Write a protein that binds this ligand. Structure first.
Ligand SMILES: [Mg+2]
Lengths: 235, 204, 240, 231, 212, 222, 233, 195, 244
């Protein structure tokens, strides 16, 4: 057939480019970074009404100060999360401190290109890694299967990514509050989602310096959705 | 401390006219303490008989090993193993543990099914074959058995006479050994019948 | 060793070997899982193309992983045994180290992890198997029902079906299963499970297997006559 | 065509297409400039962003107190090669109490990249590197290609539109080589050189990345408002 | 060294001395023999100081990874068994450890596990480990009741270390107190044995043999 | 039989002030009854405002210091030039030491610097990696001669206020850098008189927010 | 773990104003047997370094080959191998020190005590010691084995501290070294009369002196010494 | 640990095991249960070196429980004892052998017979009517030799066991803090809470 | 490199089938027919040797029926050499079990073990599967008399009567027609030979073209005897049943 680690004539790795297509088919995940915290939100996208939606875990804790959202082949993320958690805890053991968000992200991205003929293929999942440290404050990273990671003020990944990113382009400014960011994720998720957005088919989360990483209750998210509807009907 | 004399016990084997005999005591102990009076040390794989003295865990282990090996032998060869062949198997198996050996004193006894020839053999713990015509001895009272056998034995004994000779050789040897006794068994082996007899002896 | 990358991405972003593993599941006999208020029921199809079978000794479709958890499947039968073995070993390993039996979610997560591993390991193909894992967590009376598939994704279900014609029985369950009020008793849950299989099975004779799992390691498999009574009562009500 | 399925296959004209495709990834990468005088050596790098919300990808990596490089192409491959350089610099210091010569650093990178071109299963590195350093024989600038070819130069540039900067340096050769004992003026020449490779976009505060090493100057990277001076 | 821990109505009391010696030489009087594994779990150090510090700190990392994966507080049983299984792998290599893994969970209640470098793992109500363990046991056994108050239980643990600190040459310096509740452990201060001895002597009337 | 260990003598002393820290050590290096060197530096600046000494077997001492300095360098590479805090350095050294649990670095390690609140900090390690933050710690040959003196003169142990007669302790007033250096010098002068392995020279490294400063003093050479 | 078989005794050395001097006798002992009388134990590396070695001779010959191999390796792809990128004494020492400590850490030491004497690029004197344990130290005077006990005291009377180095000339330094070698010949039972001496000067370079002998010895007083106490004749 | 006894009567197997756990100079516990249920009708008591005892017992337990699930079937006491012997026989030539002695008391549901197996740390297996490990047999066997009958009831077996424990409490120097007694029969395993 | 020449033996078809398993089953369909019939008082194994010669030494020949232990036997259909590799592995497993537990291996456990080995070759290793289908005839004290079959996929099932090899469709119909639950060994012997006689591709069924075996409790008292029939004994049973 052909090598797994083969370059195309354009100078791109076939398998890495193909894994990016799998991520485009994944459910939407959005992250927004502010000076009061970083917000992470995801589309759950249950394949049937009999599927208990609260068992869909596409937002995940890595450490108390670092959270993570995923999009694509979500089964592939489990080993990446395991590595991240191990890396975060191991660094605390060696250095009696929290690990930098960038350093954690770099550790995860080192796995990405360890494939050949090591694992047999790249990961088919993109990660939004959000967190806080004392040196660089609130941060949001986008970890790809290419091994590259970009820092973002705001970022959307998944099926409605390019539409959501254009919306994040206009809406984001440096003086956003946490409450404003929460509603903004809910607004953009509702726009790109096929089904109608509610507290059962969408999930919110955030990371603050004081309280750390927290996944939002369905009751808490429901109130923010109701607050969103009213403010959009307000003009 | 010495593995070959922790548990104690003895085996003796003799040849007769168109027959062989193999016998053993029934004691198993932890040095001074008597633990079991039913620990038989003679086993058989088809018509080939194997006595094993020494460290009891190895006695058990080797029995299980030779059952294993003679069963596969039979399936592939489509016939029961012979005493001459089995003797070589025992030797090979012991020597493959040359620098970590089983602490045992095996004794093979049987009649070749084709030639009808009586056969006995003995081994050291490491596999060296002692193929004597007259008799083989093994265990913690081997000196005593050598003394008994050397005087009591005569060649070409009939099965029922050979029984008396080997029985008296075993019994009186065991009575001069603290770690042997607590009952005894004697196998009288002919080409197509085998009689097993439990002997009455002092229980101290 | 054999290191060939069998499971790989295609230009359209698909891993065909994982997708072809799902086609093996589609071919497998139908399996259904329904959880009531205080029980879970696992229904399984037995294709009647094979008669002269010895049902005493023939591998049963539902397998105990521990005394409190069970696993049924659709797809390749030989493949399922490897997942069942690994799960059973992990269940004992968990008891040995954590001094507590596995939760149903944990056991599901483990099996799903094994399935995932085989989708990006060299020299191996994915499992042609989807599983339904059901039971009750230790000292807990809440019913649990999970599903796994070749890709390695897993999730919780109020009711679910897998295998051939699973589209039809899922259609049935989606209109007949009420979340606000699930099957309150064992009878109601088993009845709904048998009803759902009768949409697909053909004859209600030896083609339907039912296993009921209750809290505190109370697992029992229904016999032919017991199931036949449900089959009789369902159709007699239907004649109206 | 039929001879580009893997790195182990020569074409009928004696070409290694996988290596040439890896070379192509560098051309797609963002521009970075390298130049030196007799006292100092300077790296200037145009960082690339994904969009307006995103950060600008870091281009410059420190290898030791006296050595470092700038990258163009696959960033993860630069991380692997730079990590390897860090270890070799560090081995030299620990074992021989000796700072690793820049020329010897180039020889090591060449040999590491070469093994990936001759063996089955692997792939060439998809990145180009510009290594600067100051050692016992003064200032140095190297250009690394993932074919294995390493070249010592007075100045150079790699990446998209790098030809414009490379021509400028070829004209300015006699001027910038003489900029001794003046770091600011040497950087100015580097910023003016990389400007020849710009179209549409211009050098902003979070766009530009500069690094320098010299006689009494450890390898230090300048980003953010630290490079506003040179805009 | 003298370390103790006991279960009671209000949870667990943990009490330790503070002395570290190399032969007759007193290396330190300010040593921490309670390892704060996490906000809910405590461990005592006896035998090898490094072995106890290192591996119980490591234990905290394992407990953190557990509750990240399982989304649930690790049990005292599971936590203690991670440590015992670890030291059992090293058995023969020369690790020296005698510790009490202490915790308070919903499913278990207040639990204490004695863990050993020989691989021993024992659940119990009262444990004492160290060169001055026999002295502490006496005060504990004669005064212990399940229905002790948190105030009295804290004093009993303090007084028992003092008993050992006085008689055992390799115990002393100061007393560290902890109270383990379901919501986490609570530190109850450092108490210099020198000052504590005279205070207890006067107020309690004990140690009449000693001139003060 | 080959003995991989040796004793190079020497004595070191770390004292934590209110907003400063000192780590001192003699410069004499010995085997048995011979002097190898009258000036062989034993306390080292490791960067990030941390000073270190690994006293005992000098080959293991040099190996550990070298490896720790290396750890500081790679901490900068891996974590965006972040400053290694004294508490983080201490935990890192524990793992370096415990890494050789079954073939130990035959040294007694001390580091000094400032914590993240700017206060003076000293950490003390045993050969296999058990460690603790301390206010005052002497290490090496004459440690038993120095520590009791420090208990008395730094922490005011057994000292009470005149007139009260044992009822009121002498208050623990803060010592200045000039006051600490006096106690360090007198500790080493006394140790030199009564311990044969101590002498030649005294080198003190003082750590403040401004950086690391060095001071050298002569000791008796007999 | 081994035991030394064929052994070499003291190596002695000192710094002076413009460089360093190092010396060692030409004997390879076999226990109490003075087996080999033509053993060179000073091994020059380039024109700026001399490595003096005592202890096991078979290990010395191994170390000698490592240094020879080091020079070859340094010349590979190195246009400045005879200039800016030539081997320094500090490079040579650190390499040996690494090897010695690694070997002791594998419980298989090179059974030696080594002194690396040389002059650096900037003209600085280099003099440092390393042995089978990987222990290292520097001093204005360095000596191994018996030299440590008898040579150092004499050499330290010339250069007692760092400030005495600029005051010490090459003639005074060489005189002290030569006298120390005589004292060792009087008093070390595993020494020989024949020795080699090497001077590494920042101006005049490396001067290697072979086939030197201990001379001007005092023995005449021995004729008057009779008996062990009371004996007169 | 110290004393473990076993006696096979008419219709059951009785295992008695000491409660003391002494670690050096102090008795750390006086209520320790030195036994593990391998299967519903098979109990194993154990005594030997610290750590190894419980590690081994739990390892055997896990393996038998694994077999029970895989086959949906309870192994016979004989089969379990042979498995245990092999593990100990494997162990004795290892880098660091398990220093563990065991008694396996089981009721064979197929044969409707109680069975007692004695296995030491070397892998020395014996089937017995009554058994012990260590010094326990030295004090008790003379009483068991005298009084034992194969047709004894469970109540008679317990009385003979009390006499054995009384002799141990009289002549043994060590205080083993009494014994926990368990009975294995056709109905399964149960503990005699008053002894 | 080497990838070019790799057949990829362990992959799914678009339909979800294992190519090599399906093609191995096609291979097995051209092998001589083997039949197993389970009765209340024993099991019968009957099998047809493929187009033999008059010069073949039959009495020492064995291509169909093999002994795994004293209680369990197998009938082979497919590549004989492949079967012998698996047979020796099975013989070893039975002995390992006997050594461990001191009890004869239960039939299903042995069957599961061999079936798991076959499965492995279909999922990993990149090797071709074993082109073999077994009929397992055996006895243990839990389930009594048991018949199983396994095929290259590693899938196994239990049976009252079953055929493998050539003309299984025709053979299975004939067995399904005449089999009853209360049947005895002597009746099963007759059914097996009658089935082969009708499904055979040869002109007539003779003793030299057959291998035959019975597992009976027809051994003196509570125990089981395996009987591998000799050429003369197969000739006698053919006359007794009235086929020749
Ligand atoms: Mg007697």
């Amino acid at each position: 057939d052909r090598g797994v680690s083969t370059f195309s004539p354009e100078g791109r790795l076939f398998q890495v480019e193909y894994s990016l297509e799998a991520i485009k088919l994944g459910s939407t995940a959005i992250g927004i970074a502010t000076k009061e915290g970083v917000v992470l939100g995801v589309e759950k996208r249950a394949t049937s009404p009999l599927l208990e939606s609260d068992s869909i875990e596409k937002i995940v804790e890595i450490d108390r100060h670092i959270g993570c959202a995923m999009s694509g082949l979500t089964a592939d993320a489990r080993s990446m999360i395991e590595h991240a958690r191990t890396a975060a805890v191991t660094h605390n053991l060696y250095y009696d401190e929290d690990i930098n968000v960038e350093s954690l992200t770099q550790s995860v991205c080192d796995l990405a290109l360890r494939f050949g003929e090591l694992m047999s293929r790249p990961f088919g999942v993109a990660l939004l890694i959000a967190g806080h440290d004392a040196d660089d404050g609130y941060q949001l990273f986008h970890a790809e299967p290419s091994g590259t990671f970009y820092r973002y003020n705001a970022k959307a990944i998944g099926s409605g990514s390019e539409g959501a990113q254009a919306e994040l382009l206009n809406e984001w400014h440096s003086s956003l509050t946490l409450k404003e960011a929460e509603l903004l994720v809910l607004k953009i998720l509702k726009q790109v989602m096929e089904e109608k957005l509610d507290e059962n088919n969408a999930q919110l989360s955030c990371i603050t310096k004081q309280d750390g990483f927290k996944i939002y209750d369905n009751e808490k998210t429901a109130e923010l959705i109701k607050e969103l509807k009213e403010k959009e009907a307000a003009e | 401390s010495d593995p070959s004399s922790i548990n104690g016990g003895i085996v003796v084997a003799m040849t007769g006219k168109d027959c062989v005999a193999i016998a053993c005591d029934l004691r198993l102990g932890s040095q001074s303490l008597g633990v079991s009076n039913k620990f038989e040390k003679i086993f058989h794989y088809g018509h080939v008989f194997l006595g094993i003295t020494g460290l009891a865990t190895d006695v058990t282990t080797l029995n299980e090993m030779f059952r294993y090996k003679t069963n596969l032998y039979k399936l592939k060869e489509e016939r029961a193993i012979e005493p001459e062949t089995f003797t070589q198997l025992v030797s090979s198996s012991l020597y493959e543990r040359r620098f970590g050996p089983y602490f045992v004193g095996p004794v093979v006894a049987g009649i070749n099914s084709k030639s009808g020839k009586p056969f006995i053999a003995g081994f050291d713990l490491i596999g060296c074959i002692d193929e004597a015509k007259d008799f083989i001895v093994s265990g913690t009272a081997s000196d005593q058995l050598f003394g008994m056998c050397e005087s009591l034995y005569e060649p070409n004994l009939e099965p029922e006479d050979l029984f008396e000779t080997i029985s008296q050789a075993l019994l009186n040897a065991a009575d001069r050994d603290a770690l042997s006794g607590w009952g005894a068994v004697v196998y009288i082996i002919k080409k197509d019948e085998v009689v097993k007899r439990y002997l009455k002896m002092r229980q101290d | 060793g054999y290191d060939r990358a069998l499971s790989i991405f295609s230009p359209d972003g698909h891993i065909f070997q994982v997708e072809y593993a799902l086609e093996a599941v589609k071919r497998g006999t139908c399996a259904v899982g329904v959880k009531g208020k205080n029980c879970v029921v696992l229904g399984c199809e037995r294709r009647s193309t094979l008669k002269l079978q010895d049902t005493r000794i023939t591998p049963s479709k539902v397998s105990k992983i521990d005394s409190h958890v069970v696993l049924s499947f659709s797809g390749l039968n030989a493949d399922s045994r490897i997942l069942i073995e690994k799960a059973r070993v992990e269940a004992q390993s968990h008891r040995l180290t954590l001094e507590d039996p596995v939760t149903v979610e944990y056991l599901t997560r483990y099996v799903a992890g094994v399935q995932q591993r085989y989708t990006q390991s060299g020299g191996v193909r994915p499992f042609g198997v989807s599983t339904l894992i059901a039971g009750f967590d230790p000292r807990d009376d809440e019913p649990k029902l999970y599903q796994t598939e070749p890709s390695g994704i897993y999730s919780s279900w109020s009711a679910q079906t897998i295998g051939r014609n699973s589209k039809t029985v899922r259609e049935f369950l989606e209109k007949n299963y009420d979340r606000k009020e699930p099957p309150a008793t064992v009878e109601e849950c088993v009845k709904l499970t048998v009803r759902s299989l009768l949409e697909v099975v053909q004859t209600g004779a030896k083609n339907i297997e039912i296993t009921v799992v209750k809290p505190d390691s109370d697992i029992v498999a229904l016999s032919s006559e017991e199931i036949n009574q449900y089959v009789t009562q369902i159709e007699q009500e239907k004649q109206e | 065509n039929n001879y580009d399925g893997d790195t182990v296959t020569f074409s009928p004209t004696g070409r290694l297409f996988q290596v040439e495709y890896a070379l192509e990834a560098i051309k797609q990468g963002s521009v970075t400039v390298g130049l030196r005088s007799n006292t100092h050596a300077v790296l200037v790098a145009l960082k690339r962003n994904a969009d307006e919300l995103s950060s600008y990808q870091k281009k410059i990596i420190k290898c030791d107190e006296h050595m470092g490089l700038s990258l163009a192409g696959l960033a993860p491959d630069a991380r692997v090669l730079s990590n390897y350089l860090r270890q070799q610099c560090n081995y030299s210091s620990l074992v021989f109490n000796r700072k690793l010569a820049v020329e010897r650093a180039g020889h090591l990178l060449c040999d590491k990249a070469q093994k990936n071109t001759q063996s089955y299963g692997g792939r060439p590195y998809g990145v180009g590197l510009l290594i600067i350093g100051y050692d016992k024989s003064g200032a140095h600038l190297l250009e690394f290609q993932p074919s294995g070819n390493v070249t010592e130069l007075y100045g150079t540039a790699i990446g998209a539109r790098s030809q414009g900067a490379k021509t400028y340096l070829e004209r300015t050769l006699d001027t910038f080589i003489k900029i001794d004992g003046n770091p600011d003026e040497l950087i100015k020449a580097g910023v003016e050189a990389i400007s020849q490779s710009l179209r549409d976009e211009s050098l902003t505060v979070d766009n530009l990345s500069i690094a320098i090493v010299g006689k009494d100057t450890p390898f230090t990277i300048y980003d953010g408002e630290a490079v506003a001076k040179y805009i | 060294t003298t370390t103790l821990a006991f279960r009671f109505q209000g949870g667990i009391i943990v009490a330790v001395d503070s002395r570290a010696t190399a032969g007759n030489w007193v290396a330190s009087q300010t040593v921490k023999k309670v390892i704060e594994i996490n906000p809910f779990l405590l461990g005592t150090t006896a035998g090898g100081a490094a072995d106890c510090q290192f591996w119980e700190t490591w234990l905290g990392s394992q407990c953190r990874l557990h509750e990240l994966r399982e989304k649930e507080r690790i049990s005292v049983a599971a936590a203690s068994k991670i440590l015992s299984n670890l030291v059992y792998q090293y058995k023969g290599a020369g690790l020296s450890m005698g510790t009490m893994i202490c915790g308070y969970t919903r499913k278990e209640g207040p639990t204490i596990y004695y863990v050993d470098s020989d691989g021993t793992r024992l659940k119990g109500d009262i444990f004492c480990v160290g060169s001055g363990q026999t002295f502490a046991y006496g005060v504990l056994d004669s005064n212990y009741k399940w229905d002790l108050s948190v105030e009295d239980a804290l004093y009993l643990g303090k007084r028992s270390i003092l008993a050992a600190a006085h008689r055992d040459a390799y115990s002393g310096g100061s007393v560290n107190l902890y109270h383990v509740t379901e919501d986490g452990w609570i530190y109850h201060g450092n108490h210099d044995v020198g000052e504590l001895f005279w205070k207890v002597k006067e107020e309690e009337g004990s140690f009449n043999n000693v001139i003060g | 039989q080959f003995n991989p260990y040796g004793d190079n003598g020497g004595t070191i002393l770390g004292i934590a002030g209110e907003d400063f820290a000192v780590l001192a050590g003699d410069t004499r290096n010995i085997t048995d009854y011979s002097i190898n060197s009258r000036y062989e530096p034993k306390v080292f600046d490791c960067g990030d405002n941390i000073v270190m000494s690994a006293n005992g077997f000098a080959a293991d001492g040099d190996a550990l210091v070298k490896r720790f300095k290396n750890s500081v360098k790679w901490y900068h590479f891996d974590h965006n030039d972040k400053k290694l805090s004294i508490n983080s350095a201490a935990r890192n050294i524990q793992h370096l030491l415990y890494g050789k649990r079954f073939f130990p670095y035959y040294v007694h390690t001390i580091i000094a610097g400032l914590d993240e609140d700017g206060k003076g900090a000293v950490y003390s390690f045993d050969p296999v990696g058990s460690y603790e933050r301390e206010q005052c710690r002497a290490g090496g040959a004459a440690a038993s001669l120095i520590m009791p003196f420090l208990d008395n003169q730094v922490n005011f142990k057994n000292q009470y206020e005149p007139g009260t007669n044992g009822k009121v302790k002498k208050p623990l007033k803060y010592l200045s850098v000039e006051e600490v250096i006096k106690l360090v010098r007198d500790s080493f002068t006394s140790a030199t008189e009564r311990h044969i392995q101590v002498g030649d020279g005294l080198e003190i490294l003082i750590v403040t927010k401004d950086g690391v400063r060095k001071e050298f003093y002569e000791l008796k050479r007999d | 773990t081994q035991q030394p078989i064929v052994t070499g005794t003291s190596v002695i050395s000192m710094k002076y104003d413009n460089g360093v001097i190092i010396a060692a006798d030409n004997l390879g002992s076999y226990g109490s047997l003075l087996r080999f009388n033509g053993v060179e134990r000073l091994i020059p590396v380039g024109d700026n370094t001399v490595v003096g070695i005592s202890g096991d001779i078979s290990d010395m010959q191994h170390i000698e080959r490592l240094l020879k191999d080091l020079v070859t390796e340094n010349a590979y792809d190195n246009p400045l191998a005879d200039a800016e990128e030539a081997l320094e004494p500090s490079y040579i020492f650190e390499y040996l020190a690494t090897v010695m400590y690694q070997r002791r850490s594998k419980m298989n030491p090179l059974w030696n005590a080594i002194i690396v004497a040389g002059v650096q690029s900037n003209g600085d004197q280099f003099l440092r010691y390393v042995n089978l344990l990987g222990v290292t130290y520097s001093s204005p005077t360095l000596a191994t084995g018996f030299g440590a006990h008898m040579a150092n005291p004499l050499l330290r009377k010339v250069v007692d501290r760092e400030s005495d180095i600029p005051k010490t000339t090459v003639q005074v330094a060489e005189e002290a070294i030569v006298n120390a070698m005589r004292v060792l010949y009087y008093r070390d039972a595993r020494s020989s009369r024949n020795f080699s001496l090497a001077i590494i000067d920042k101006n005049t370079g490396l001067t290697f002196k072979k086939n030197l002998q201990v001379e001007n010895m005092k023995w005449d007083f021995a004729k008057d010494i009779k008996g062990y106490g009371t004996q007169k004749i | 640990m110290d004393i473990i006894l076993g006696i096979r009567v008419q219709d059951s197997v009785i295992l008695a095991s000491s409660k003391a756990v002494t670690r050096g100079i102090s008795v750390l516990k006086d209520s320790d249960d030195k036994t593990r249920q391998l299967s519903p009708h098979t109990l194993m008591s154990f005594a030997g070196e610290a750590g190894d005892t419980v590690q081994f017992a739990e390892y055997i337990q896990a393996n038998i429980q694994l077999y029970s699930i895989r086959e949906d079937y309870e192994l016979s006491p004989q089969a379990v004892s042979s498995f245990v012997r092999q593990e100990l026989a494997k162990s004795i030539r290892s880098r660091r052998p398990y220093q563990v002695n065991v008694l396996i008391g089981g009721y064979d549901k197929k044969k409707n017979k109680p069975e007692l197996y004695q296995i030491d740390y070397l892998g020395t297996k014996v089937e017995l009517p009554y058994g012990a490990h260590g010094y326990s047999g030295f004090y008790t066997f003379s009483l068991l030799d005298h009084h034992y009958r194969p047709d004894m009831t469970t109540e008679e077996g317990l009385d003979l066991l009390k006499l054995c424990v009384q002799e141990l409490e009289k002549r043994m120097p060590m205080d083993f803090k009494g014994v926990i007694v368990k009975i294995v029969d056709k109905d399964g395993i149960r503990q005699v809470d008053d002894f | 490199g080497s990838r070019r020449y790799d057949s990829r033996t362990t992959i799914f078809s678009p339909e979800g089938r294992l190519y090599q398993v399906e093609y191995a089953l096609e291979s097995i369909s051209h092998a001589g027919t083997a039949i197993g019939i389970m009765a209340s008082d024993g099991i019968v194994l009957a099998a047809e040797r493929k187009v033999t010669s008059t010069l073949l030494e039959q009495d020492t020949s064995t291509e169909k029926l093999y002994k795994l232990n004293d209680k369990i036997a197998v009938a082979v259909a497919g590549l004989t050499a492949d079967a012998e590799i698996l047979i020796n592995t099975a013989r070893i497993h039975a002995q390992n079990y006997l050594k461990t537990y001191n009890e004869d291996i239960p039939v299903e456990i042995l069957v599961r073990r061999l079936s798991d080995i076959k499965q492995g070759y279909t999922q990993h290793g990149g090797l071709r599967p074993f082109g073999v289908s077994f009929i397992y005839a055996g006895y243990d004290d839990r389930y009594g008399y048991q018949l199983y079959t396994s095929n290259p996929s590693g899938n196994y099932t239990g049976w009252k009567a079953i055929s493998v090899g050539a003309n299984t469709s025709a053979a299975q119909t004939l067995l399904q027609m005449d089999y009853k639950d209360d049947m005895k060994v002597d009746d099963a012997i007759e059914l097996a030979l009658k089935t082969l006689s009708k499904t055979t591709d040869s002109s007539a069924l003779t003793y030299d073209r057959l291998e035959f075996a019975t597992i009976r409790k027809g051994a003196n008292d509570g125990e089981v005897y395996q009987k591998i029939f000799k050429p003369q004994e197969i000739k006698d049973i053919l006359v007794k049943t009235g086929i020749t």
